[PDB]
Amino acid sequence: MYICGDSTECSNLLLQYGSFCTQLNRALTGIAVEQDKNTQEVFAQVKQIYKTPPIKDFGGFNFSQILPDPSKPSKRSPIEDLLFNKVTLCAQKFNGLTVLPPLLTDEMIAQYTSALLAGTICSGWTFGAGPALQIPFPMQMAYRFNGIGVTQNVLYENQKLIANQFNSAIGKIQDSLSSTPSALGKLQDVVNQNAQALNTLVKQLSSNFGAISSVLNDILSRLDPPEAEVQIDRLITGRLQSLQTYVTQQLIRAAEIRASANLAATKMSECVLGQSKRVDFCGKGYHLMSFPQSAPHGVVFLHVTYVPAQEKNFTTAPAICHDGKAHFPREGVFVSNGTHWFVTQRNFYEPQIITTDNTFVSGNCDVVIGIV
């Protein structure tokens, strides 16, 4: 249809150029199948749909801006709704340029994301590694704090403050997304690149390509077949080259998108369904969890990160030579405020008196350097 629009005098000439149209159709079909597999791999990781818990009293934390809200006709969270009504971008159709619909509709993607979210809130991360095990959310927060080094008593003794900070950050992220003009740049750039490619492909139709006219009907109506065959050949060559260029560009861009989708699936599996200890791969600072949020032709995570704050610096000694024996700390640092010494955790100032419970002895103190 693209090369020779409903013209026998052009199709019977295109038949001479071998199996080119079949090759291009096969390539584009492969690209579409790859896109479907990309979406399925990214979102359809856990195949058990967990119902969204009705209550919102999760010990202080407020999952109102990430959880789906049923008041709207579309079952999308406010952040998902903002993401949808921030990427706006027409329908070519016409000359043999059809657009296939995605397998997983946006409602299905939203339901998958909601299932992942409800699994994260309810069972923590065991739902991604077996059967879901219910556990109170403060306890899950404590068991995610324990992963990054700090002990449980840091969370429980500061549960209200931590919940307030979490709610404040969740509220701030919506304003940050809405106010900033760039925001969703990758998805919009992908859409713009595809639109520009398609528009250029259509624009290549209106070009003489070294012929007498840009319209096949005009050429075949104004000329006898023996001399119109050359002009039709020139037009066919030009259109074939344009289609080949478009197909190659689509293949390369689809490969790039597949790489990005594999990265996104890795992030979804290794962050939402667990907690990663890879530095600065799953957010800035120490990682606690993440919350997936559906977006048009993409995914948008909400990484949650513990990040240290106002610090006080003391004097430290590697070990303590008590009775000739050099006690070393078990799970801490030896600090001191100038007069008294203490052993405390590495990522928080919780001084404790240096007892034999917090230290282990490893011989005489004539070998260590800097022992106090």
Partner 1 sequence: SETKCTLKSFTVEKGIYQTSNFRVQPTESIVRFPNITNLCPFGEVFNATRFASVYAWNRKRISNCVADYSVLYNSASFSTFKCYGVSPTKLNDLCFTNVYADSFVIRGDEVRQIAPGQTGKIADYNYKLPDDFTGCVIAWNSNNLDSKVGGNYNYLYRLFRKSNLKPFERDISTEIYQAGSTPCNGVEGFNCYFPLQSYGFQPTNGVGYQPYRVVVLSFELLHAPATVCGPKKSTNLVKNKCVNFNFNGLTGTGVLTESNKKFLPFQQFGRDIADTTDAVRDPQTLEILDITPCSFGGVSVITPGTNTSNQVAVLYQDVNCTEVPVVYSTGSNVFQTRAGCLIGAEHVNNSYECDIPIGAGICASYQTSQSIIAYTMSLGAENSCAYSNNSIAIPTNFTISVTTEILPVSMTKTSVDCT
Ligand X SMILES: *[C@@H]1O[C@H](CO)[C@@H](O[C@@H]2O[C@H](CO)[C@@H](O)[C@H](O)[C@H]2NC(C)=O)[C@H](O)[C@H]1NC(C)=O
**How many residues at the interface with a second copy, by CB under 8 A?**
75
Q: State how far the Cα of 259 lies from the Cα of 265, in Å rounded to an integer.
A: 10
Residue 100 contact partner, candidates a second copy, ligand NAG, partner 1, none, CB within 5 to 8 A by sort of partner: partner 1
**94 part of the interface to partner 1, by CB under 8 A:** yes
Report the SS3 class of residue 121: helix
Choose one: 21-29, 103-111, 119-127, 308-316; the region binding a second copy (CB under 8 A).
Answer: 21-29
Residue 338 contact partner, candidates partner 1, ligand X, a second copy, none, CB within 5 to 8 A by sort of partner: ligand X
**245 part of the interface to a second copy, by CB under 8 A:** yes
**8 part of the interface to partner 1, by CB under 8 A:** no
Q: How far is CA 91 from CA 97, 99, 177, 195, 196, in A?
A: 9, 9, 28, 10, 13
Relative orientation angle of helices 186-203 and 225-267, to the nearest 10 degrees: 170
Q: Which of 315, 316, 337, 364 binds ligand NAG (CB under 6 A)?
A: 315
The amino acid occupying position 71 is S
The site map against a second copy for 259-278 (x = CB under 8 A) is x-xx-xxx-xxx--x----x
Binding site for ligand X (CB under 6 A): 56-57, 62, 64-65, 171, 337-340
Closest CA to 202 of 1, 18, 12: 1
Q: State how far the Cα of 146 lies from the Cα of 177, in Å rounded to an integer.
A: 31
C-beta of 172 vs 284, nearer to ligand X: 172
C-beta of 267 vs 327, nearer to a second copy: 267
Per the document, the length of the chain is: 372
**192 part of the interface to partner 1, by CB under 8 A:** no
Q: State how far the Cα of 253 lies from the Cα of 186, in Å rounded to an integer.
A: 13
Q: State how far the Cα of 343 lies from the Cα of 321, in Å rounded to an integer.
A: 14
Q: Which of 252, 255, 263, 279 binds partner 1 (CB under 8 A)?
A: 263
Q: Which residues contact 246 (CB under 8 A, 6 or more apart)?
A: 197, 200, 201
C-beta of 241 vs 337, nearer to ligand X: 337
The residue ranges that bind ligand NAG (CB under 6 A) are: 313, 315
